[PDB]
């Protein structure tokens, strides 16, 4: 029926969400999952939040990604207000007005990574590899675990995703396969906007 997680709240703030939850009989969990219907973000007054993992996974799953004002306003009026009317407009990274949560909310047929094969390659910080994988697989990509496991042929498109920082060689990936190499920001920017970005900005230089 209805299930929520929260992001960027103080315990005090969390308490009000639980209050909201009890009142309306909304489920409340710590981990976002398949079932999660709602993601409550701490935003500023114009509905701009931090770019948190729950934010990415919420957009990726076509959920409601709603400002915490949905909660406090709904408590202030003893009624559950319009999820539509509080939705997140953007974030500190991708701009204050991009409206990706809704793009994703409606565009579940035209998924930004339809047709792609993605290998999240090497080591990653601030975000478990499997959650990034889950994220791209939620956006309609096929996940590959080994550079050598890419589906040779055409009609399909492989991409290697890395986070440069994380390694003590990421220019010498092209020596091991025939795919564009891009940074994690390709995915993250793409997911935040729910618009597949052009690799240009994100391509990493590969040695012959
Ligand atoms: Ni093509």
Q: For CATH 3.40.50.10190, list the domain ranges present in the chain.
A: 1-107, 108-208
How far, in Å, CA of 112 to CA of 157, rounded? 13
CB-CB contact of 40 with 64 (8 Å): no
For residue 92 the two structure tokens come to 């500190």
For residue 83 the two structure tokens come to 């999820």
Resolution in A: 2.5
Please indicate the experimental technique that yielded this structure: X-ray
Strand order in the sheet with 38-41: 27-28, 3-7, 38-41, 64-67
Homologous superfamily of 108-208: BRCT domain (3.40.50.10190)
How far, in Å, CA of 16 to CA of 76, rounded? 11
Residue 188 burial (10 A CB sphere; 0-12, 13-18, 19+): buried
Nearest to 205 by CA among 162, 167, 168, 146: 162
User: Which distant-in-sequence residues (6+ apart) come within 8 Å of 101 by Cβ?
Assistant: 58, 59, 64, 65, 87, 88, 194
How far, in Å, CA of 155 to CA of 204, rounded? 23
Distance (Å) of CA 155 to CA 104, 124, 162, 196: 25, 29, 23, 18
Cα 172 to the center of its chain, rounded Å: 28
179 Cα–ligand 1 center, Å:
12
116 Cα–ligand 1 center, Å:
9
134 Cα–ligand 1 center, Å:
23
- Degrees (nearest 5) of the Cα angle 60, 65, 70? 175
Longest dimension (CA), the chain: 64
Residue 27 bridge partners (DSSP): 3
155 Cα–ligand 1 center, Å:
7
Kind plus residue range of the DSSP H or E element containing 55: helix 53-60
Scan for tokens 């949560």, then name that residue: 101
φ, ψ dihedrals at 95, nearest 5°? 115, 170
Strands 3-7 and 27-28: what pairing? parallel
**Domain 1-107's class?**
alpha beta
115 Cα–ligand 1 center, Å:
9
């Amino acid at each position: 029926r209805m299930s929520m997680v929260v992001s960027g709240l103080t315990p005090e703030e969390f308490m009000l969400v639980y209050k909201f939850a009890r009142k309306h009989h909304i489920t409340l969990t710590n981990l976002i999952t398949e079932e999660t219907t709602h993601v409550v973000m701490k935003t500023d007054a114009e509905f701009v939040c931090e770019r948190a993992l729950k934010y990415f996974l919420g957009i990726a799953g076509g959920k409601w990604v709603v400002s915490y004002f949905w909660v406090t306003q709904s408590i202030k009026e003893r009624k559950m207000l319009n999820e539509h009317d509080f939705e997140v407009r953007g974030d500190v990274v991708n701009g204050r007005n991009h409206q990706g949560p809704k793009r994703a909310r409606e565009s579940q047929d035209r998924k930004i990574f339809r047709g792609l094969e993605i290998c999240c390659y090497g080591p990653f910080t601030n975000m478990p590899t499997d959650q990034l994988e889950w994220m791209v697989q939620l956006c309609g990509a096929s996940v590959v675990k080994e550079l050598s496991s890419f589906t040779l042929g055409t009609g399909v498109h492989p991409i290697v995703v890395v986070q440069p920082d994380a390694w003590t060689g990421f220019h010498a990936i092209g020596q091991m396969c025939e795919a564009p190499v891009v940074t994690r920001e390709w995915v993250l920017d793409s997911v935040a906007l729910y618009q597949c970005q052009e690799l240009d900005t994100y391509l990493i230089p590969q040695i012959p």
